[PDB]
Amino acid sequence: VSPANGAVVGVAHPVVVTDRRAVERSIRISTPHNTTGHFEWNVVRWVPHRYWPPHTRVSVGVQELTEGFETGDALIGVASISAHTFTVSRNGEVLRTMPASLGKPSRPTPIGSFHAMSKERTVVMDSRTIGIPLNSSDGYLLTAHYAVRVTWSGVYVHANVSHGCINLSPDNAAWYFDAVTVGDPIEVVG
Numbered sequence: 001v002s003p004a005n006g007a008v009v010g011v012a013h014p015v016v017v018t019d020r021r022a023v024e025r026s027i028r029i030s031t032p033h034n035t036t037g038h039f040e041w042n043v044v045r046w047v048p049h050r051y052w053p054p055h056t057r058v059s060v061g062v063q064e065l066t067e068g069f070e071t072g073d074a075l076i077g078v079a080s081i082s083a084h085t086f087t088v089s090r091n092g093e094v095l096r097t098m099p100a101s102l103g104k105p106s107r108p109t110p111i112g113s114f115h116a117m118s119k120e121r122t123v124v125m126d127s128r129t130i131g132i133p134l135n136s137s138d139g140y141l142l143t144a145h146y147a148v149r150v151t152w153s154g155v156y157v158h159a160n161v162s163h164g165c166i167n168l169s170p171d172n173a174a175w176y177f178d179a180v181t182v183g184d185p186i187e188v189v190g
Contacts, residue, residue: 002014030062054071076185100166103163106138119148124143125144
């Protein structure tokens with residue numbers, strides 16, 4: 001079960017618990033205004049449908065075990081593929097709309113709805129680790145700085161960028177990294 005206890009997270013953060021409709025019924029999310037959601041599939045997650053409510057305490061009851069977490073501010077960053085931007089807002093007001101490189105004209109960032117999964121100060125990225133030569137046009141060996149993970153699939157917040165990853169300036173990527181906590185909503189759109 002994730003979220004873990006007390007964990008201060010964000011409002012696109014899924015509820016994650018490890019006949020599907022059977023265990024789907026032993027799970028219930030208790031929210032102040034009865035926040036709804038749907039299921040997604042082993043391992044199933046429950047996700048709130050219009051983000052969470054900000055600064056709301058969330059309770060999760062699964063079998064005889066019940067664990068809870070609190071949401072901080074609502075920080076949303078949006079990656080527009082037409083405009084070449086990653087816009088960041090915190091509770092209503094955009095703070096900093098930063099120009100972003102979202103992949104490359106071959107494999108641009110996949111449009112969709114996500115959370116900030118992890119924060120890694122520097123992470124080295126080696127394409128040889130899953131089978132891509134470094135002389136390939138989609139080949140690389142790089143040490144990323146201020147890396148905020150977007151997906152399990154390896155998309156990151158951290159130009160002819162690969163994997164569809166998102167590339168910001170060093171000054172811009174520092175701020176998002178300091179301002180962000182896991183769970184912080186991530187939206188790729190047009």
